[PDB]
Enzyme design. Sequence first.
Site, PDB file in Angstrom:
ATOM      1  CE  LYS A  12      74.489  78.543  54.072  1.00  0.00           C
ATOM      2  NZ  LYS A  12      73.412  77.709  54.663  1.00  0.00           N
ATOM      3  CG  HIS A  94      77.697  74.747  57.413  1.00  0.00           C
ATOM      4  ND1 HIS A  94      76.663  74.255  56.638  1.00  0.00           N
ATOM      5  CD2 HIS A  94      77.325  75.996  57.786  1.00  0.00           C
ATOM      6  CE1 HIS A  94      75.719  75.170  56.539  1.00  0.00           C
ATOM      7  NE2 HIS A  94      76.091  76.234  57.230  1.00  0.00           N
ATOM      8  CD  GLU A 166      75.362  78.049  61.289  1.00  0.00           C
ATOM      9  OE1 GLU A 166      75.882  77.167  60.548  1.00  0.00           O
ATOM     10  OE2 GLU A 166      75.112  79.208  60.899  1.00  0.00           O
ATOM     11  N   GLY A 172      68.109  78.169  56.391  1.00  0.00           N
ATOM     12  CA  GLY A 172      67.476  78.346  55.104  1.00  0.00           C
ATOM     13  C   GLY A 172      65.976  78.194  55.105  1.00  0.00           C
ATOM     14  CB  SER A 212      66.186  82.091  59.407  1.00  0.00           C
ATOM     15  OG  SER A 212      66.037  80.861  58.733  1.00  0.00           O
TER      16      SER A 212
END
Lengths: 250, 250
Positions: A12, A94, A166, A172, A212
């Site tokens: 990122k 994403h 995801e 996160g 995660s």
Amino acid sequence: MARKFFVGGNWKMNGTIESIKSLVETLNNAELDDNTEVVVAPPAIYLPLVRQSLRKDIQVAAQNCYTKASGAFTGEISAEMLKDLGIPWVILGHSERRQIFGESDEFVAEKTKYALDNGLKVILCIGETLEEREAGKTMDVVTRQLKAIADKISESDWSKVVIAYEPVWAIGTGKVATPEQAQEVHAEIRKWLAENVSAEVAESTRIIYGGSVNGGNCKELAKQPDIDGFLVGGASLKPEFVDIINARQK
Amino acid sequence: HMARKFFVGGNWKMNGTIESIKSLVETLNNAELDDNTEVVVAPPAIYLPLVRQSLRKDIQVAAQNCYTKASGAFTGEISAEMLKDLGIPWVILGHSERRQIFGESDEFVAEKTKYALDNGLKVILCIGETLEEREAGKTMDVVTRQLKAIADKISESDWSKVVIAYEPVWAIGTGKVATPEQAQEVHAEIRKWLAENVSAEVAESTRIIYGGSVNGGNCKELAKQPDIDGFLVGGASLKPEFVDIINARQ
């Protein structure tokens, strides 16, 4: 089913020449499972540095690209530029670009077809929000996201695609999906690919899990039969990334 | 023009390869350039290291965009600290293509501008009205509202690191350049706005440059207008005539 284990690291918007050199040196000295396919995704301005210095068994990904060959698109990078620099992969769709930058299902689909037609391989991200899951719409969301690309690309095109599931609530947040939770979505995704694309595409397409993933939860996740690896965010900046690459080892 | 140093930027947009860029850079490296002109060129982010290392050092380099934060989970974004880390001293912000295609708000551009200035960058800040806003008599309202969003956030001394680019959207890439009188009329309004809303000193010293179908054939008459301090050049910045534009005042 003969699917090669795949671990991507999405850096990122993180890194300096100094910290990237250190991360690259750690990977260049690491003992990596011989059967893991590894890809890392640096910020665009560091693609030359990483591509020039990283061990050549780990391929480099861009974090985004646009839909056209060239033109008046201030701030965008094209697939041709990636190919020009020797960057073989690109992450598309994403969650952060869908939400923060409003990238639509069709926009991701157009990007994916353009990338594939011009020499790149694609990590294609899909995933539902907490509210969509609470509403019972998890599969409706992720299959609609996939369907936008399936309608645009050829059955042969899928050999150059890795699907990343995801879930947004896991990104996160420290709330990883449980092995059962991830497994049941990947099985449903693979089932969708069997009926809508082909049985061979379903059997050979890697579906990786992201959200995660870290050194402490990756081994259990990796045992699930329809999970073919990981897309790793926060942990890809740390030496722990090596343990995630080695998640199928005992 | 009131001791305001003449300023010419080249925005390469989403164009270039290593080979085409080497040729472009060699033409600049060999050129005779007016020493009284400040020159900046903006390559795509993936070529910032290539250009920053091979280009004559009297021409500075700009990024075409950056984000609002120091680092974090913003897949596909570049931060101002990365630009500083690479020795890139400028950034173009608010370009019409980002405002229109990528939906950047006035406030978002303003947040980027303040963050970039706060972390050592200089900013080419793009403002400008569409054809339809002009057809409703909104040119001055639009460009001063775009400007006010930055003024509301940055301090008076920050303006010393800002160049204002007035680029009417109807002139970008269309071949319909503003006439010297049309462009001069808007630049005088902008400087008037600066004197009324910031300070007389900021109004007197800030470069207001013009963009939109500038080329070697029309730059000299445009550069004669008193409130036009230079040019932001799109398509012609990829061509040898970029040199003619740099030398528009000699």
